[PDB]
Design a protein around this ligand. Sequence first.
Ligand SMILES: CCOC(=O)Nc1cc(-c2ccc(C)c(NS(C)(=O)=O)c2)nn2c(C)nnc12
Length: 130
Amino acid sequence: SMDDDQVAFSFILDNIVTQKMMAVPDSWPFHHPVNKKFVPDYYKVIVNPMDLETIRKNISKHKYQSRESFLDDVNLILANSVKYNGPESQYTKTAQEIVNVCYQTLTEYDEHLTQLEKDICTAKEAALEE
Ligand SMILES: CCOC(=O)Nc1cc(-c2ccc(C)c(NS(C)(=O)=O)c2)nn2c(C)nnc12
């Protein structure tokens, strides 16, 4: 209702992740960091690994003040799979649908998230004045 803007924004981001993005068919390889046991050279090819659980952990620490830095990490999941698996691999097409669902949901909530983003930024600027 008031002064809870960051808490609310993060709460919505987590629900987008758990309810929309993690619900993509066969998306489970993206729910957690790549297990080196199964992909022995992943961390030698991908310099900035990223996954949905890592994004949730970021959300719980309130890393994202706007959807833009949230989308940076989401789009990073797709670009990593493009680099490691190739553009037409089934992994990449799954990750591409994870990204699509993310954008579709953000667009559904656009006006609402803009309001939270404005209030979060103006509060941070006013709090750093002191
Ligand atoms: C070299 C042939 O191509 C590949 O095998 N690539 C990929 C493979 C897997 C993958 C496999 C098996 C398992 C059990 C898991 N589960 S987890 C989240 O613990 O690591 C993941 N994820 N993956 C992701 C993301 N991006 N690429 C891949």
